[PDB]
Amino acid sequence: AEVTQLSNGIVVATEHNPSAHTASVGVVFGSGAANENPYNNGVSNLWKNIFLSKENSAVAAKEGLALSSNISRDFQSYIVSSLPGSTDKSLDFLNQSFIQQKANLLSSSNFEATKKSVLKQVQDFEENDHPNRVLEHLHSTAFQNTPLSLPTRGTLESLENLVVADLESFANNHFLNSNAVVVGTGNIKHEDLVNSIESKNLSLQTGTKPVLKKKAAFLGSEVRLRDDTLPKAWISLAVEGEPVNSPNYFVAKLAAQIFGSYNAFEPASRLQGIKLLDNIQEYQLCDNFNHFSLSYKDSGLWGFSTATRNVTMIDDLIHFTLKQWNRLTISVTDTEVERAKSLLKLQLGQLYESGNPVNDANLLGAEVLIKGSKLSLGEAFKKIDAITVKDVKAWAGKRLWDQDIAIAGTGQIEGLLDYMRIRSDMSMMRW
Amino acid sequence: WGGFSVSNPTIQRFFALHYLVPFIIAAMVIMHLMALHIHGSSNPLGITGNLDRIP
Numbered sequence: 152a153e154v155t156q157l158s159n160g161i162v163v164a165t166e167h168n169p170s171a172h173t174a175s176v177g178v179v180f181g182s183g184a185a186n187e188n189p190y191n192n193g194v195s196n197l198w199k200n201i202f203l204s205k206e207n208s209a210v211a212a213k214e215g216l217a218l219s220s221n222i223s224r225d226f227q228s229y230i231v232s233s234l235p236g237s238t239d240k241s242l243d244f245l246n247q248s249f250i251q252q253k254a255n256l257l258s259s260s261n262f263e264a265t266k267k268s269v270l271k272q273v274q275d276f277e278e279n280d281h282p283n284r285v286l287e288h289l290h291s292t293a294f295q296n297t298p299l300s301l302p303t304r305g306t307l308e309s310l311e312n313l314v315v316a317d318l319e320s321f322a323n324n325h326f327l328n329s330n331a332v333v334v335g336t337g338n339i340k341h342e343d344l345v346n347s348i349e350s351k352n353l354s355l356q357t358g359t360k361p362v363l364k365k366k367a368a369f370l371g372s373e374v375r376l377r378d379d380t381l382p383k384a385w386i387s388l389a390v391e392g393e394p395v396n397s398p399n400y401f402v403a404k405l406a407a408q409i410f411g412s413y414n415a416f417e418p419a420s421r422l423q424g425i426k427l428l429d430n431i432q433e434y435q436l437c438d439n440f441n442h443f444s445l446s447y448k449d450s451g452l453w454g455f456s457t458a459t460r461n462v463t464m465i466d467d468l469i470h471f472t473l474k475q476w477n478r479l480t481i482s483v484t485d486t487e488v489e490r491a492k493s494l495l496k497l498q499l500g501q502l503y504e505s506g507n508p509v510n511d512a513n514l515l516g517a518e519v520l521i522k523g524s525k526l527s528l529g530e531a532f533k534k535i536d537a538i539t540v541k542d543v544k545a546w547a548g549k550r551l552w553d554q555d556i557a558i559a560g561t562g563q564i565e566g567l568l569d570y571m572r573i574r575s576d577m578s579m580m581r582w
Numbered sequence: 583w584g585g586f587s588v589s590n591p592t593i594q595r596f597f598a599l600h601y602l603v604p605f606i607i608a609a610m611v612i613m614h615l616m617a618l619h620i621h622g623s624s625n626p627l628g629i630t631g632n633l634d635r636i637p
């Protein structure tokens with residue numbers, strides 16, 4: 152596809168697809184959980200559910216409109232969807248919710264029922280969803296005392312002390328035209344969207360959001376949440392990685408694809424060309440693992456997550472996995488690098504060429520907000536095809552060899568050994 | 583003594599006894615460590631140590 156950006160006072164981006172049967176229109180702001188403090192942690196999660204509340208959604212469903220929203224660390228989104236010949240109504244609804252009249256939504260009755268609904272989501276998340284809350288605690292110890300540590304949903308202790316005035320203060324400082332991108336995906340022409348905006352003289356708020364004092368800093372650390380009543384052990388482990396607008400962005404993504412993802416109960420996942428699986432399958436040390444490479448405006452993370460029921464062989468799983476990471480600096484084969492090139496292109500093709508216009512609106516707005524434009528998928532494939540074996544060794548010797556780590560765990564983790572027995576496995580030194 | 587006083591038979595047998603017994607001590611030390619492995623060591627507080635262990 153082909154993107155098209157403009158600036159008439161308002162930044163308008165679009166990605167037309169004539170094959171789609173729908174159209175999405177929305178606005179993406181360049182502020183998220185990393186632009187908050189510990190006192191108001193969760194105020195962006197309440198704006199999501201106020202936008203999706205029942206009396207607001209009822210007004211939309213009478214004209215054939217569906218609503219969505221998403222809160223992350225670096226951005227926030229508010230999308231409206233419609234049939235292709237009804238995109239003029241999508242913009243009017245968005246006009247009387249952000250540019251005008253966001254006081255009818257913050258009434259007393261609408262704010263108390265919404266608050267009670269959010270306190271029950273975050274409570275069930277902390278007691279039932281173990282893989283995702285251990286990955287949240289990883290961000291909280293790795294980036295402690297910096298903005299990138301705060302959870303995106305909020306906490307139960309900070310949510311209870313939020314009143315209406317906290318919602319209005321956060322909007323005056325962040326929902327600004329200088330911090331906003333208007334997006335359009337699916338079956339919508341680029342020129343029909345901009346002329347519709349020019350015929351209304353819209354302006355959210357002018358600009359100059361706050362300054363954000365501290366930068367993100369990685370600290371080697373651990374946090375353990377032991378619970379012997381649960382039936383598994385959930386563990387995550389990472390080093391410091393690459394931010395966006397880094398030269399090593401795609402080299403870190405390719406090195407995670409070398410070790411990849413595993414499911415013990417799927418037969419075809421046991422046959423992948425991954426050397427680590429010859430050690431794990433002898434005694435069945437885990438149920439699943441997945442390797443990630445996450446990237447933000449200021450820093451990143453590189454590592455893996457696992458879940459297991461073999462609570463007596465945890466130390467052999469962590470040991471064998473970290474000995475394969477060492478091979479990226481010493482001994483990594485040309486065959487392993489060509490496999491990972493092909494599967495990474497398939498992974499990026501499914502993410503960017505899905506059918507949903509709502510997913511494409513979130514990717515487009517976040518990219519334009521953070522580098523001014525969007526890289527094509529044909530240009531990204533050429534960068535991936537130009538990575539050599541020497542490039543992986545240079546990246547790993549800087550980022551992996553003899554470097555500090557962050558750890559988080561929950562469940563039956565008595566068999567997870569101390570920090571320094573694990574820190575020592577990051578360098579071979581039988582060498 | 584091997585005779586009627588501390589004499590040459592006494593000194594020659596004391597040296598041969600003296601080389602042996604250090605090797606009997608080495609076997610009592612192995613048995614000593616085996617009895618420590620089944621319950622482990624104690625601690626200066628005198629309570630259980632199974633809640634906080636390091637390698």
Ligand code: HEM
Pocket residue numbers: 611614618622623624625
């Ligand atoms: C060649 C002589 C000996 C050797 C090599 C030896 C070796 C050891 C070692 C390595 C330990 C574990 C670490 C420690 O507790 O310091 C230990 C513990 C112990 N030894 Fe010895 N030992 C010897 C003689 C003795 C003697 C003569 C006694 C008592 C009459 C004794 C009684 C104990 C006890 C009660 C413990 C356990 C202490 C505790 O866990 O609190 N050992 N020994």
Ligand SMILES: CCCCCCCCCCCCCCC(=O)OCCCOP(=O)(O)OC[C@@H](O)COP(=O)(O)OCCCOC(C)=O
Pocket residue numbers: 608612613615616
């Ligand atoms: C007729 C009955 C016996 C027949 C054969 C019995 C074989 C003995 C051990 C076989 C069983 C091993 C499996 C575990 C078990 O249940 O037994 C414990 C073995 C003895 O452990 P340990 O040697 O006291 O360790 C004690 C540790 O400190 C390791 O020992 P280390 O200090 O390295 O010792 C070397 C020092 C001197 O040794 C010499 C010269 O003999």
